[model samples]
Target: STINFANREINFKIVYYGPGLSGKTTNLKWIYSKVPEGRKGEMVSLATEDERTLFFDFLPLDIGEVKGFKTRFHLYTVPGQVFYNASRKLILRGVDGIVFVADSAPNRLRANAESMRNMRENLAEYGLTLDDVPIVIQVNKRDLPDALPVEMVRAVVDPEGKFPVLEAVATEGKGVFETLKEVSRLVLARVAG
Candidate 1:
């Protein structure tokens, strides 16, 4: 988070993180399409040959004011491939909140677990843990026949049930805003304290 005293604004960063093909970018795209032009900035994406994010997808959203300071949230998605470990860590720098987007496909259970583990390790490098920051989990692709139940996904990713978990069909724009709203609210509340 950033406090720009000169501009009377506070900026917060929120990252959408998960395993490859987990619909991180899809969530951002759906959100971009729904938010009004006046409330959001242009969405920027860097992608690969198969249309996967090569680096990150970024969108800036204005969520009105907090304590007389304009509150702006910068949303980003990290490339979920394991090869992009360094890139993921870099994108997570200064993150105020996280949305762990896990693919609900039954076969993706291992990938989801690994990604969550990676996230914890990476966050530790910055002297932060999941418990230290606001986070929400989104199990995407729930519409698929092979998708695992939200409870099972949560058990794998968050056995302790520490964070909020939402079942989502991100491609159809389901549960997208709710996930965002919850994370934003948590971040704002943390900042307020």
Candidate 2:
């Protein structure tokens, strides 16, 4: 988080985190498409030719104000592949909130668990934990025939009831805004208070 005193602007960073090809990028794309150009910055993607996010997908949104300061939220999606662990950690630096986009396919259960653990471990490296930051779990790809139950996904990713769980089919924009709105609201509460 940062404050630009001259402009009375408060900036918050929110990251979309989860396992590889788990709809992290999809969520960002849907959000970028929905946000009016006047209220948002250009969407930028650092990705391989295969279109996987190599580092991150960045989108900046100005969502009105908190108190007298204009609130700007920078949204990002971390690369979910295991080999990109270093990049994931780097992107997480100074993050104010997280939306974990877990794949709902039954086969992805293990990957989701591993990624969740990895996220926790990385946060620890910064002397921070998920418990210290606002987070939301988004179970994506819910439209798939073999998608697991939200309750099951929740149990695996957030069994402790530490965060809100949202069901989503990101490609069609279902639950995207809800997830973003909840995380942004939490972040604002944390920063403004």
Candidate 3:
């Protein structure tokens, strides 16, 4: 059963997961800057001394009412560096959905694959499987010269053909909203039942 908040609302937690320098933080930053002021909360970034997203980044959004139930979403970005294992595990404690931001650079294809596999492993350790979670894949940095084409990215990331994939250039805010909306909707559907 879904836990309804005192405000008579459903709260969903959406997380962006991927490899280091894969634009996880960039995507969140872009989304925070682009969303309307009244719709989003302050984007709280918990970064290391070097300002890399260390612990996490979070932004709350009021997505309005649905079926007489108010809906609130909290978006989070986990540290993408593999060494941040403890931090990532903590951040994913109660996540309702995930948006995997993959680096589309051709050279980083192995890193992308490894990161996805790592994510699946980490989630399993928490007693959750990829099949039980809502996931969206964003092939980020599409504007880069060596980025992979959308079809290629899809072939690799969505090999099972279950998750939705989007082409994105976070710095330009392209495809950010659509990705957010789709994942948010998935979270809502999961919570509604």
Candidate 4:
């Protein structure tokens, strides 16, 4: 539903999904900061008392043109708290791309697996299972001591080995751009090719 063309313009909704504190919002903030300002929209966030993204963060970016039409990418982050399943489902609507931010900390494997499960089930609710949309997995916090092996994280995050999984330390901008670049390529390829 998000891969559409109208008014000679193309728009895609790319969602950042993962467990709480997995650096989903951090990824958006990094991209927002480097987007040259002129081509981006104001970021809006609904937060809790601790500012843990009660809802989602929205940022619309005009990323130059594709062919003859203006190309835009709207970035959104689903609230990661497991109890916010309904909120996550709502945010997943119209998703053209997905970036599953898995945590690399030793003890986060369970959360990562559960979050991935939740995402899979929620996506099925919208008839977006299988190859309906592009998904990229990012293992964050690689710098942490005793970080899980990428191989280990990949096993649970994407047991099928069907998606590209990268490493990212979002807070310091490591691997963030590469992660976005890969997912953006997939998003554009699906609709523009």
TM per candidate comes to 0.89, 0.88, 0.83, 0.87
CA error at residue 149 for candidate 4, angstroms: 0.5
Give candidate 1's root-mean-square deviation (CA, Å): 2.9
Encode model 4's per-residue lDDT on 116-188: one tens digit a residue: 8888899999987847789999999999988989999989889889999999999999999899889988987
lDDT, model 1, position 31:
82
Error of 2 at 147 (Å): 1.0
- As a whole number from 0 to 100, the lDDT of residue 29 in candidate 1 is 84
lDDT of 2 at 3: 84
Q: Write the per-residue lDDT of candidate 1 for residues 89-161, one digit (tens) a residue.
A: 8778999999999999989999999999999999999999889989999999999988888999999899999
Clash totals for all models, in order?
0, 0, 0, 0
101-154: candidate 3 lDDT, tens digit per residue? 888898888888877887888899889999899999998899998778877876
The most accurate candidate by lDDT is 1
**Candidate 1: global Cα-lDDT?**
0.82
Model 3 segments more than 4 A misplaced: 1-8, 48-69
Steric clash pairs (candidate 2) = none
Which scores better on lDDT, 2 or 4?
Answer: 2
The lDDT for every candidate, in the order shown, is: 0.82, 0.81, 0.75, 0.80
- Shift in Å, residue 11, candidate 4: 1.3
| Candidate 2 TM-score to native | 0.88
